[PDB]
Amino acid sequence: YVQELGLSLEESRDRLRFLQLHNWLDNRSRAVFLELTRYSPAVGLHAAV
Amino acid sequence: LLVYMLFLLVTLLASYGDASCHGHAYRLQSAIKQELHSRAFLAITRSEELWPWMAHVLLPYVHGNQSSPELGPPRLRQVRLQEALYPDPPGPRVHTC
Amino acid sequence: KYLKSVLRELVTYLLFLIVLCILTYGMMSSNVYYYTRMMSQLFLDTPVSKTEKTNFKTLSSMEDFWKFTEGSLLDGLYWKNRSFIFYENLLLGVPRIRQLRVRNGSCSIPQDLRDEIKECYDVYSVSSEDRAPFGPRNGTAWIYTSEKDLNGSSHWGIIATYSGAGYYLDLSRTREETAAQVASLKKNVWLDRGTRATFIDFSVYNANINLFCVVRLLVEFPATGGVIPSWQFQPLKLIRYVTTFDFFLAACEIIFCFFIFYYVVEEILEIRIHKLHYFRSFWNCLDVVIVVLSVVAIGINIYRTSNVEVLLQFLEDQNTFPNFEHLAYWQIQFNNIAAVTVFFVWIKLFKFINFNRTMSQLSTTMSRCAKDLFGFAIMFFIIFLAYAQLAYLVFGTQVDDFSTFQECIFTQFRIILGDINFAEIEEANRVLGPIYFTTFVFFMFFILLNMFLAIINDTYSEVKSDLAQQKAEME
Amino acid sequence: FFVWIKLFKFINFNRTMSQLSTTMSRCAKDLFGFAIMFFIIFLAYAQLAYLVFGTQVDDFSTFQECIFTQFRIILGDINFAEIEEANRVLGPIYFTTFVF
Amino acid sequence: DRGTRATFIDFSVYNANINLFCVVRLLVEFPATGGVIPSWQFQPLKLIRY
Amino acid sequence: LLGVPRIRQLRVRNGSCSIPQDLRDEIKECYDVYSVSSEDRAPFGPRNGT
Amino acid sequence: HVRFVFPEPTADVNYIVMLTCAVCLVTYMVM
Ligand SMILES: *[C@@H]1O[C@H](CO)[C@@H](O)[C@H](O)[C@H]1NC(C)=O
Ligand SMILES: *[C@@H]1O[C@H](CO)[C@@H](O)[C@H](O)[C@H]1NC(C)=O
Ligand SMILES: *[C@@H]1O[C@H](CO)[C@@H](O)[C@H](O)[C@H]1NC(C)=O
Ligand SMILES: *[C@@H]1O[C@H](CO)[C@@H](O)[C@H](O)[C@H]1NC(C)=O
Ligand SMILES: *[C@@H]1O[C@H](CO)[C@@H](O)[C@H](O)[C@H]1NC(C)=O
Numbered sequence A: 001y002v003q004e005l006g007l008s009l010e011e012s013r014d015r016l017r018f019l020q021l022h023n024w025l026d027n028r029s030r031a032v033f034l035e036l037t038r039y040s041p042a043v044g045l046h047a048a049v
Numbered sequence B: 001l002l003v004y005m006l007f008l009l010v011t012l013l014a015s016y017g018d019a020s021c022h023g024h025a026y027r028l029q030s031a032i033k034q035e036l037h038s039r040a041f042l043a044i045t046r047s048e049e050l051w052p053w054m055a056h057v058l059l060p061y062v063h064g065n066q067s068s069p070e071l072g073p074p075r076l077r078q079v080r081l082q083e084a085l086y087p088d089p090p091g092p093r094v095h096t097c
Numbered sequence C: 001k002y003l004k005s006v007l008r009e010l011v012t013y014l015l016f017l018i019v020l021c022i023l024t025y026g027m028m029s030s031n032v033y034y035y036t037r038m039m040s041q042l043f044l045d046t047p048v049s050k051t052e053k054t055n056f057k058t059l060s061s062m063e064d065f066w067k068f069t070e071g072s073l074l075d076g077l078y079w080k081n082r083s084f085i086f087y088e089n090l091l092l093g094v095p096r097i098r099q100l101r102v103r104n105g106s107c108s109i110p111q112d113l114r115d116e117i118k119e120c121y122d123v124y125s126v127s128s129e130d131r132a133p134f135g136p137r138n139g140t141a142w143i144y145t146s147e148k149d150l151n152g153s154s155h156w157g158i159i160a161t162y163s164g165a166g167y168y169l170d171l172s173r174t175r176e177e178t179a180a181q182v183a184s185l186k187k188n189v190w191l192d193r194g195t196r197a198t199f200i201d202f203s204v205y206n207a208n209i210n211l212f213c214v215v216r217l218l219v220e221f222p223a224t225g226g227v228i229p230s231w232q233f234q235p236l237k238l239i240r241y242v243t244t245f246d247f248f249l250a251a252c253e254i255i256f257c258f259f260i261f262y263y264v265v266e267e268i269l270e271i272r273i274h275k276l277h278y279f280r281s282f283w284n285c286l287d288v289v290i291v292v293l294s295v296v297a298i299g300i301n302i303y304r305t306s307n308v309e310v311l312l313q314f315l316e317d318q319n320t321f322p323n324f325e326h327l328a329y330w331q332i333q334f335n336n337i338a339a340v341t342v343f344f345v346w347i348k349l350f351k352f353i354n355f356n357r358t359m360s361q362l363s364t365t366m367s368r369c370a371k372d373l374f375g376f377a378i379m380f381f382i383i384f385l386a387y388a389q390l391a392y393l394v395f396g397t398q399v400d401d402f403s404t405f406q407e408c409i410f411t412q413f414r415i416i417l418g419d420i421n422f423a424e425i426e427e428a429n430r431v432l433g434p435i436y437f438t439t440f441v442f443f444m445f446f447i448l449l450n451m452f453l454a455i456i457n458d459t460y461s462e463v464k465s466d467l468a469q470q471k472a473e474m475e
Numbered sequence D: 001f002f003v004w005i006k007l008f009k010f011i012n013f014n015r016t017m018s019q020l021s022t023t024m025s026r027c028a029k030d031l032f033g034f035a036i037m038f039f040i041i042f043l044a045y046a047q048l049a050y051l052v053f054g055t056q057v058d059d060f061s062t063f064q065e066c067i068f069t070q071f072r073i074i075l076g077d078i079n080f081a082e083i084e085e086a087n088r089v090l091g092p093i094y095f096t097t098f099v100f
Numbered sequence E: 001d002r003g004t005r006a007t008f009i010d011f012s013v014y015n016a017n018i019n020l021f022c023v024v025r026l027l028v029e030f031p032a033t034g035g036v037i038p039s040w041q042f043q044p045l046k047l048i049r050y
Numbered sequence F: 001l002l003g004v005p006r007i008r009q010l011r012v013r014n015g016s017c018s019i020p021q022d023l024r025d026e027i028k029e030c031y032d033v034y035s036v037s038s039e040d041r042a043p044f045g046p047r048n049g050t
Numbered sequence G: 001h002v003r004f005v006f007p008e009p010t011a012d013v014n015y016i017v018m019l020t021c022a023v024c025l026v027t028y029m030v031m
Helices: A012-021 B002-015 B023-035 B050-063 C008-025 C031-044 C062-075 C175-187 C244-272 C285-305 C309-316 C325-351 C357-368 C370-395 C405-416 C424-428 C432-446 C451-474 D018-026 D028-053 D063-075 D081-086 D092-099 G015-021 G023-030
Strands: A037-040 A045-048 C096-101 C167-170 C195-204 C213-220 C228-234 E004-013 E022-029 E037-043 F006-011
Touching: A012 B050, A037 B023, A045 B023, B002 G015, B002 G023, C008 C244, C008 C325, C031 C213, C031 C228, C062 C175, C213 C325, C228 C325, C244 C285, C285 C325, C325 D028, C357 C370, C357 C451, C357 D028, C370 C405, C370 C432, C370 C451, C405 C432, C405 D092, C424 C432, D018 D028, D028 D063, D028 D081, D028 D092, D063 D092, D081 D092, G015 G023
Parallel strands: none
Antiparallel strands: A037 A045, C096 C167, C096 C195, C195 C213, C213 C228, E004 E022, E004 F006, E022 E037
8 A cells, every 4th residue: 555755745744644643554564665766867876765 | 718708708898897886886875874864763663653753854855955856756555454463572582473 | 255245245234224223213203193193082083062972083964064163173273362272282374174066067967857857966077177156256265276376286085086276265363253254154055065075274383392293184075975074184394403313313314325325336236247137036126126115215205305395485474374285295105115115124134044054944945835825826816806806796885895896805804814794794685695704714714725734834844854865865 | 930831841751741842842943943034024014014004093003012913913803994094005005915 | 380291199098807008009191292191000018917 | 098198290391492493483482201301390389388 | 180189088987998908918818
């Protein structure tokens, strides 16, 4: 189950509080899997964080 | 001798063909790890406490003015079913949980 | 007569040895170590503020460099006129801070996602460094100054080799104005995303022992983000002839020059006379190295001490910035050359210890197994480099012990001593780390490292045996 | 200590006890002869380290400290994190050639 | 002042339970290049015998 | 605690070394490293007692 | 005359060029 969690941080706080308050991460809770990606044009390398 | 020397040249070009981008990768990954404070996260135990970490260091990193290109928005996942029935506390398993 | 000559070339070598030992005794004292240590502890170990715990050695971001500059740095430069750093060390002149930065739009972001990435700044290079006035173009901190007009030179830091130009600023003689200048620099942003290096330079005297000390601090901002700090403290000495001991040292230097001239004359006579394949033994190719290195050291010493115009120019007007970096660089080079020369001169002593049979057999054994050890070392080091390259390509991205080829070689030497323990190669790769460590230990402790001992033991036994056989039969 | 060492005068009177004593007695001259060369090379390396690392490493601050550090390197007790950063060239060379 | 080069502190204790003196000396050295180097020496002497 | 503790000091005299002529108008006083030949003996301060 | 110039534009050292000329010499020596 995916969550966007992006789009203009002043909006991301709303998503964070909605995930906190409306009973999302509890009572089964086997994974969360934070994941993003980096790109550095100076040397030309990506990164799979 | 000639066959082996051609094979060796092909192997060398296959392995060290772009070795100039091998010193940048180490510095890049180290910088990424130190920006994300990769010492508090590895000490996170379950106390409903990943949220302050997410709101303190992640979001400013993602949406900062002088931030990364980030190649798109991040994401969270979830796999699960039938919560554990409070596994036995005393004498916990080392890693075979 | 083979006795009037061996004793003749032994007393000259001995006198050379006393002269060299005397010459190298006075260039290393016990004041220098504590002199360096006190300054190092003052500037590198002090935390940036009374509430933080990070110091210059553990900087992590561009916002900690600004804390250090207006912080632990100004606390350790201006001590309550003038500024005696430990009530003894005079801060002579004015500290200077310089910045090297690259111009915007130097790289090439790709066409598709150009909508998001607005600019890029390339890694440092002389072809891609900025030379335009940025920000409030007001003084010398916002105007490019060429290397020639700044009397600078290259540095060869960690990431790259930086030039001697950039945007510089001279601080003040008292803390009250230096703090204001630093705050003014910080307000009108001076360290933007385009900066690549930052240098801080100054010097001290400490008149109690006639010994200067130049200090340089470097912070490098790589294009991939992060901060790399480095430091250098060098105890120069530029006013030598003050004490009778210094006159004695000068006489010793002159006499050393005389021995070197005599040795080069002797070498040319021995090369001209009675053979032209002189370069076939080992004790003949060691004299040439010694005379060449001594000539290089003499040339460096003459060239370095003949241009002290910077000291005189500073002593004329003492509100400038004392430029003592070239002298420090040449002192380091001279120290390296002198150390190597002394080591080889001491090695040369084996040429004379053959005074009885028990030493002759040992020399014969050592010179008879060199052919086999050289043959086996080729195989051993081919396997060594084969392991090192594999470790570099696999673990070299995320360990920091295999981050470079040199680091791989040194780590593999340290494994032999039983000094490296597997704690990082596991977390790097929980499957290939154990395999690499186990296989390396097995094939370079149980098999390949004991084949040196077999060769050496067998050679010693055979040499002793046939020498005794020849002695018994002939005599 | 010397009085305790003097027990070998009397304990070496049976077979398999006089073989070891004879082995020590018939190779003492060779051991001294080779110790001379070993210590010449040891002192040469110690003086090189004193000249190069003599003001920065705190283990080579004095000549005696250099000798004791070089004895401890054999046991496998080094830092090498300060030796390398004290001198990037001629620092690794010393360590590698000494070990070899 | 700046001219000081060393400073000593000395004393002694007895501990009559086990008859054994103890002499204590503390040294502080001020090198010519600024700084402080401390040193100590505790020696359990024994004088009254028999 | 037997008796009373004693605190002692050693100091070198001002002008025990030679400042180079170049900056002699810059630095006023110098104190050498410790040596018996360069040890102060004159009274200093409020020369009351020992 | 504009044709032949000394570029020295970038310090990015290229390993393809030196690794090809470093094998054709070892091959020659051994052969
Ligand atoms: C950098 O240059 C690009 C053009 O390549 C420009 O769009 C951008 O605004 C510049 N950034 C500055 C001046 O901060
Ligand atoms: C520029 O310099 C002037 C005087 O030299 C000073 O008054 C001013 O504050 C400086 N900074 C500016 C104009 O941003
Ligand atoms: C460089 O040349 C001399 C130093 O000997 C000095 O007169 C001049 O001012 C120096 N330049 C700068 C910018 O300090
Ligand atoms: C030390 O002696 C010099 C003269 O040699 C004198 O000028 C200076 O004032 C003296 N300093 C003190 C603290 O007495
Ligand atoms: C010196 O004079 C007497 C002893 O001679 C003493 O009581 C007094 O306090 C001293 N003066 C000072 C310390 O200024």
